[PDB]
């Protein structure tokens, strides 16, 4: 009963493929219930359209700053900003849906995609999914990006809303 | 001839890092906020009547990746401790830098230098006898800076760089 999201990804607008996920809404009910509906776009705003603005080859893809446009915004269904929910969950390796932030309780709406395990952030970013679908296109988003997370082409989520 | 010089700026995130070293190597300056995580830029530049390649780490202000920030401490020459002078907590976060300098380095004396930035701005939480005195306990350079207006930005990297130069005299 775990609600599934998809997004179609695009390079400089370009169909890149698709990729779906998981949410955890059995253990993380609040956090997977704002990806959900900024998925659908439901409440009026959310991700499609939005960028990957940092990818860093061999720890992960970021995005979903639709307020800024880049990389410092984003933005909650319950607000700017809500508190972290639970550390249940661990970023155990790739494919794995992580909430970015500025330190504890500051989830907006930025998110990651795990492309390895990456320990040192559990119990400091909420883990509420996994890729389902798609690592093959999460693994080619990851080729456009670079050390300090700069990408080569235009990375969007040009499509997005829930499975079913 | 000339010579080189690795330079390294450490400092609370917001404080203006890169926008002093886009300054310094662009000669412009936006307001747009791009968080770092990690640049490197080299510049030529004459210093005192000597040429210098100038090798600018500007680094993330960050204090989670320790393993990182030693290296950037190991191998840089001299560092700008930069803080802003509308952010109270980044002059209370300088000292954690000179410590953790002068312990990666194993040293007492490590070329410094310290940066007051954002001192176009009309919000300032920090008086400069604080910096002042701050400096002058460390027996360091206090140099005032806006990346904004280029107020300082020319003499915070060259003063680092007469500090390293007077380093290698010892
Ligand atoms: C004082 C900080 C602060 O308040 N702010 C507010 C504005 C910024 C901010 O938090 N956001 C824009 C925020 C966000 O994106 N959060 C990120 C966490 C983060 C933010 C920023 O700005 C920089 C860094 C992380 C960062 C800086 C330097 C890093 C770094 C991360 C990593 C490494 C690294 C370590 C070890 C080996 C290599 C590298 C990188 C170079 O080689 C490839 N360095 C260099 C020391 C760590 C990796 C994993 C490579 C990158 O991690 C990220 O980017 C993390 C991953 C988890 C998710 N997040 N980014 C965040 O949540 C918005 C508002 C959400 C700063
Ligand atoms: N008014 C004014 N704003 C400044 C000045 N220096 C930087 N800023 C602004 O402050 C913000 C952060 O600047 P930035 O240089 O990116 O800071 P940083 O220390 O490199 N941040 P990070 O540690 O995340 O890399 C930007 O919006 C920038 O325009 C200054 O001298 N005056
Ligand atoms: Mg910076």
């Known amino acids: 009963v775990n609600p599934t999201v998809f997004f179609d990804i695009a390079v400089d607008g370009e169909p890149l493929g698709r990729v779906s996920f998981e949410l955890f809404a059995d253990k993380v009910p609040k956090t997977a219930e704002n990806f959900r509906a900024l998925s659908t776009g439901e409440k009026g705003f959310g991700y499609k359209g939005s960028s990957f603005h940092r990818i860093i080859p061999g720890f992960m893809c970021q995005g979903g700053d639709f307020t800024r446009h880049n990389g410092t915004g984003g933005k909650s269904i319950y607000g700017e900003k809500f508190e972290d929910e639970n550390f249940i969950l661990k970023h155990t390796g790739p494919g794995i849906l992580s909430m970015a932030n500025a330190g504890p309780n500051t989830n907006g709406s930025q998110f990651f995609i795990c492309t390895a395990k990456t320990e040192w952030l559990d119990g400091k970013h909420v883990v509420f999914g996994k890729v389902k679908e798609g690592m093959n296109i999460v693994e080619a988003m990851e080729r456009f990006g670079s050390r300090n997370g700069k990408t080569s082409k235009k990375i969007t989520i040009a499509d997005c809303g829930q499975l079913e | 001839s000339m010579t080189e010089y690795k330079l390294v700026v450490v400092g609370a995130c917001g404080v203006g890092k890169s926008a002093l070293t886009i300054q310094l190597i662009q000669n412009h300056f936006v307001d747009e906020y791009d968080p770092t995580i990690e640049d490197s830029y080299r510049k030529q530049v004459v210093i005192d009547g000597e040429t210098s390649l100038l090798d600018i780490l500007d680094t993330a202000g960050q204090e989670e990746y320790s393993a990182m920030r030693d290296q950037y401490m190991r191998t840089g020459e001299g560092f700008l401790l930069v803080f802003a002078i509308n952010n109270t907590k980044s002059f209370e976060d300088i000292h954690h830098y000179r410590e953790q300098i002068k312990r990666v380095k194993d040293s007492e004396d490590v070329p410094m230098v310290l940066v007051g930035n954002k001192s176009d701005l009309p919000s300032r939480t920090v008086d400069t006898k604080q910096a002042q005195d701050l400096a002058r306990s460390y027996g360091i350079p206090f140099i005032e800076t806006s990346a ?15 500090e390293i130069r007077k380093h290698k005299e010892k």
């Open chain 2, 148 to 162: 904004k207006t280029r107020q300082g930005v020319d003499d915070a990297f060259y003063t680092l760089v007469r």
